[PDB]
User: What shape does this take?
Amino acid sequence: SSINPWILTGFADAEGSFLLRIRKNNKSSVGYSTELGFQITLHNKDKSILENIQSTWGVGVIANSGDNAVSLKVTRFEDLKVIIDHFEKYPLITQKYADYMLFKQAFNVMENKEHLTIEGIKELVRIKAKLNWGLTDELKKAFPEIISKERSLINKNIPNFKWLAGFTSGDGCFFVNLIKSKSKLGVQVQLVFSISQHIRDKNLMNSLITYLGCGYIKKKNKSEFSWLEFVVTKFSDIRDKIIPFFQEYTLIGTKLKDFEDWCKVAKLIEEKKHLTEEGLDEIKKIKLNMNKGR
DNA sequence: GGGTTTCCACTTATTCGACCTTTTAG
DNA sequence: CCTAAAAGGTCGAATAAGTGGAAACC
Ligand SMILES: [Ca+2]
Ligand SMILES: [Ca+2]
Ligand SMILES: [Ca+2]
Ligand SMILES: [Ca+2]
Assistant: This one.
């Protein structure tokens, strides 16, 4: 069905990863082989998005990824030209853009077939050192060196509303909270919209307040890790801003159905049916089919 | 047919999503 | 007193990123 290219780039900001493998290989002339590419891993229920993306781009192979997940991997060298073209025209805007640029530099090394020389393998190692998690211990041991060039700090604005629809389809969440008290009904129904993201993109998440004209930021930490949530819990902002936004700029994948169910609940709250017993049980049943499982 | 690419099965680290209860604000 | 909104978390892998092994090329 062909995905809008900005929907795709938002989705990639939220679900894509680049990869640069530099593998010790006794069968290779320089003792190392490589593999360059881009991949997306989703729950099986979202296999269709990957099928559709594959068809849109015309590249990539789909395979299971463990018990409950499926992946679209693009590593065939010629096919990376499609990836490069797309992200040149519709650039990523999270810190993943830097990983993209690292990926582009490795592609050039290999385009010139330098990866078949030891000096080329060393270049890819330097490029890899700043990519994603960086070098393994093995590579750190075989190519000891000081990485001087620090990572480039991406600072780009939400380019348009479609990017944000694709982004939310990846890392967003539409949730029906059941706040149990002791009232006559003893359950307050609260719609929650949120987007989760690593602290490295706090500026982008922060901007969502101005961009959507509602919501707020929760900072979260656990040991050495830090992440951020853009959250909307105000019903009037759900009704007047959040819902209309995704009614026009469509979500993709199964989260679309979560949003639809979310909306059915929202209409029930707008009719004050969440305050009756019969509406509550309706809301309960709708919640049961949402998000995990479905 | 040797070196290199590309694929498919599966894992590791940890960034997400999804789920809770309480406190506070109207 | 009643209900909505926010605060303040927990849980666990649908996380983001990576790895082992080998078939398919040229
Ligand atoms: Ca993400
Ligand atoms: Ca993913
Ligand atoms: Ca996701
Ligand atoms: Ca729940």
